[PDB]
Structure formats: C-alpha cells, structure tokens
Amino acid sequence: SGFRKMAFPSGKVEGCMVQVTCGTTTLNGLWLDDVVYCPRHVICTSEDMLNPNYEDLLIRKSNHNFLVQAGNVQLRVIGHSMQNCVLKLKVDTANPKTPKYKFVRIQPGQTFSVLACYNGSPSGVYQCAMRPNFTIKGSFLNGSCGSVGFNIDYDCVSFCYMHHMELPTGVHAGTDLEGNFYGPFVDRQTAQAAGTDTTITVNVLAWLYAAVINGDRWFLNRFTTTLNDFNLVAMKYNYEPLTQDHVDILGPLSAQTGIAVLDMCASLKELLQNGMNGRTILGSALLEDEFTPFDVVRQCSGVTFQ
Amino acid sequence: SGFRKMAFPSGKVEGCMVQVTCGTTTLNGLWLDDVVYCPRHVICTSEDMLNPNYEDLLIRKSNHNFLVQAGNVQLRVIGHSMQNCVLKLKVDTANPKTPKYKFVRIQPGQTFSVLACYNGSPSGVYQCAMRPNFTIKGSFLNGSCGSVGFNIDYDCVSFCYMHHMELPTGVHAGTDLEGNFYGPFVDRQTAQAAGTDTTITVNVLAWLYAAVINGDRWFLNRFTTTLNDFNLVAMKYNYEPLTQDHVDILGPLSAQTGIAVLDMCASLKELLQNGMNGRTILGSALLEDEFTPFDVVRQCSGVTFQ
Ligand SMILES: *C(=N)[C@H](C[C@@H]1CCNC1=O)NC(=O)[C@@H]1[C@@H]2[C@H](CN1C(=O)[C@@H](NC(=O)C(F)(F)F)C(C)(C)C)C2(C)C
C-alpha cells in the first residue's frame, strides 16, 4: 500500500551529464554517443539574452570557444551546429556510459522525471507533468539549464525535455531534444505568458482510482453521469474535456476496482461542486492531476527497470 | 524559483541492489564490499511469518540455501550471520560498484531518499521523513523488502533505512543497516500500532521559509509570540515542541529572509487556529512537514553531488 510521487531511477542519466561553458556562461549538457546537447543560449552574455540574434552570435563562435567538461576531464569539440533552440557539439570521444536511448516529444498530460543539474553535476530528481499549457512546475535555479526530463522503458531512456527558462508565474519552459519548445515560448529574456492552465482530467480520475485501490474511498457517491454532462461541468472548473480515448486508458484501473469511469466522473463532479470539506484523499487536500493512468498502474504493480 | 519534493540521484545505490532468494521467498539485498545485507525474514515461509523463531529457522539454513543474484549473475555465498533483524551474507566477490559509504541511524524529523526495488531491480525513487512515531509514508508492495533509504554527502552515500513491513494504517516500518528497527516494531505478522503521529514543527517552519523565498507570503501576519506560548498552542494540534536548537537550525533561512523564527511561529499559530481558507502555500492546501531546514537550504542554493 501507499501512493507516492515517484521519479524513475536516475543512474542511466547521471552518466550523460557534462558541464558546457562558453565565455563566462556555464550550463549542463547531455552527452550521448559523440554528441553533446545543450541550450543554445550558452553563447549569450547577460546583455545578449535581452534580444538575441542566435545566428549572428553563433557565427562569432568556433569549436574551441566551447569548454565541455565530464568530471575533471575536458572533451575536445570537433564540430558544432544549431538545431532549433539546442546547440549540438560534436566531440572526439563517444560516451562509454551511453545507454540505449531515444528522443521523444511528449504530449500534454504526460509525465516525466527531471534530474536537476548544476555545473554538470546532478543535484536531485523529481517527477513533472507537461501541463496542458506546455509549462512544467519544477524547481530550477541559475545554472539549471540543460537539465533533462526523461522516462525509462525497461532498458531504454526516452529523453523528452531540456530546461531553458522560467516564466513570470514561477513555472518553467523548455524544449524537446531536437530544440523545439513545448508551447509558444521563445529563448529571449522578454515578458511571456503561459496562458490559462487547465486540469488534466484523465490524470485526476487515475489518482481517484489509486485512492480507491489504497482503501481511501469516502468520495464515492451513489450517482453516475454521461460524458457530455460531466464535460459540461468540468469545463466550468477549467478541466480538460474527457474523451472516449481517456475512458479506454482508464480501463485497467476500472477493471481492477470494479468502478465504471462514468460513475467515477459523477463523484469527481460532486467533489468539484461541493469541495472536500477539510477531508483528504491520499493525504492531499486538493485534487491531484500529475499522475497518468500509466503512473498509477506502474505503482499498483511495481513495474521494474534494468 | 519553484519548490519540489526532490530525491537524491540514485545511481550510486542502483549499483548496490541485488536479488536475494531463500526457498520460494525473494527480496532485495544491498551489496556493499564482500557483504550483502537483507531483511532476516527472507528465511521465512508465509506460515513462519506468523510467529517466527529466527534463531531456530536460521539454524536450518546453510550458505547454499541463499541465492544472491546481480542481474543475470549468481554470487557465491561463503558466510552468513544474523545482526538484529538483518541477515548479512558474505560473498566471494566485492562489489566493483561499491561507492564511498557509511551506516547511520537517522533521527525523527530527518529525511532520506528511498529507491523502491522489486527482484533486485530499481523501480523508482522518492523522498521520506522518519516520522516522530518512527514510521514512514512510503509506497511499498510485495517484494519491496530490502529497498533502502539513504542520503548523499557529495561522494559518500549514507545508508539509514531498510524496508521490512507495512503497519495497519498503511504506513511503513523498517530498520537501520545494523538491523535495529526504528520504533517499537517487530518483524512478525502480528497486529502492531504506530502510535499518535505528531507534526515536525521545525520542518513546517522550514517549508514556510521556502514559501516566503518563492514569493508566496500571504500567511505572514503582523503578530509575534514566545517559545512557550507557541508550544502551548502547537501541543494542542499534535505539533512537536519547538526548542532553541530548532531555532538555531532555522538561522540561515531566518537570515536569508529577514524574518525572526518567533514571528514565523505566530503566523503558524494563526494558520493552525484559523486554517488556510481554501488558499494554498507552494501549491498545497495543507501544512507540509517533510522538508527539513537542510532540504530547504539545499534547494534554495542548488547543492550538487559527485
Ligand atoms: C538557465 N540556466 C536559466 C534557468 C532559469 C534561472 C532561474 N530559474 C530558471 O528556470 N534560464 C534563464 O535564465 C533564461 C535565459 C534568459 C532569461 N531566462 C529566464 O528564465 C528569464 N525568464 C524570462 O525572461 C521569461 F519570463 F520570458 F521566461 C528569467 C527572468 C531569468 C526568469 C533566456 C535566454 C531565456
């Protein structure tokens, strides 16, 4: 029993972190094979960050202007290219610790582990969800850029995120490992808005199923509803509209507990309309939306990795 | 900015996990140097767990009754001893991945990372606090025993916990790495009570300081209090009594924010007496007590590890 927010083991990603310095600016890089990936704003000064022209700024840089360091060991840079907002530095040495990996673009609602890094060294690991507004709720300070997000599929590390910036509301923004930002964000120190953040409904239902599995089920009322009537109520609370695809993904949880998705939707409706009354669910006084149906199944089975 | 519950990177501990089988019972072991450590109830059958006599049960076991497996590789057991509730199996091969380590007994209120394991393979990592009642709020299923808790001090892994059992209220219990349980718990399948769980006051104050650091400070009232008047109110809410040692540990946070500990105590008093009114602090509708002053400082600086 017990339900906790859990990150994937980070060992396979720890071996891929390096420190990338250009001028005075130092950040983290991801060393896979003979390529190091980092945010392209490593070439900027503080002044440049205000309105950068990355092409012109990069045109003044050679391979020798990039200091790539793995522990107390320097890697020799023999190539460099800008791919969208990421800089790829080709090095003469392949990472002997390169795991089986792939680059993926995660969808909103999906979760991933973040290994927060400073000066190429891991500081900590935590779980995040890609919000519907393409922001994350992380914990990143100066030097954290280049810290990556990932999932583990038994032996294969799937990289999905690279940290670039923090927005005015305290939330975070970054790119996939090809350099494309999630959301409308740009890598420039200029005022940018995240936009209305909605609640990942399928994840809230998955979290209600974990609560039921773990004996916590006071919220289960005797009512039921329809997808359109539930959606009509959920949109009033800024909840993402539940679809038949979402219903099918909740399938294994619905089967393991004997509770129809539409019955669980009606209990969610009464929780949204009447609140929690100071009571808790899994030790929380709010409805939690950062656990996918897969996160709940993995934890209610104990899925292990290599 | 941003404040998240963060586990230490788990790579150094991943290399120490092995699978220990005795009869049909399989659990996790911690392989450091030429010794493997696991819960002594690996020698029990389901029936034995009801009222075990570990000495007599162990007396029927030889080195060859213990199957120790690292990946798809068997370790040859050449010695075995019971140290309190842990079984230590001496193997012919030292772990080539043994990091710099030490065994420590943590105090209540202190936190640590748990690398949850099944069949010797890591499944996930999360942070826990040793409650004042010597229980933890984990996420452990069948096979999770032998999963360990640890802290990292730059290069040195400090092992402080080994999982053994789950109590009736869903909470967890285990031992240090010498086999002594935290709390009054025994490794026997018999009804056992955790006892009244109190709130780690110094940690709640540390979490209020992280909230202030991260711009969240609505709760800051214009009142102040004394240690005895605050304690008189905190004991009514099952809060651990704040001491001058606690005040001194909050020092760096008090200095970084310009807020006296006793002023922060008065705001905590009004939060306990009048509630949060549906408002949140760091995205939480409850007062959080699983972040020590050290956890807050580490995150509001970005302390990194080897
Ligand atoms: C990279 N190490 C940091 C990560 C930041 C540091 C504070 N917390 C973080 O997440 N990235 C930056 O400092 C980026 C960088 C220039 C400005 N910057 C920002 O994150 C700024 N944000 C913005 O201007 C905004 F709102 F548009 F996102 C900052 C004001 C420092 C928070 C570049 C190139 C975007």
Ligand SMILES: *C(=N)[C@H](C[C@@H]1CCNC1=O)NC(=O)[C@@H]1[C@@H]2[C@H](CN1C(=O)[C@@H](NC(=O)C(F)(F)F)C(C)(C)C)C2(C)C
């Ligand atoms: C070891 N792999 C498991 C971990 C358990 C499995 C479910 N979640 C956990 O934390 N340890 C056990 O199954 C231990 C083991 C016998 C019984 N057991 C328990 O945890 C039981 N608890 C108790 O009887 C109680 F309340 F006293 F703690 C159980 C009923 C299965 C929860 C031994 C030797 C203690």
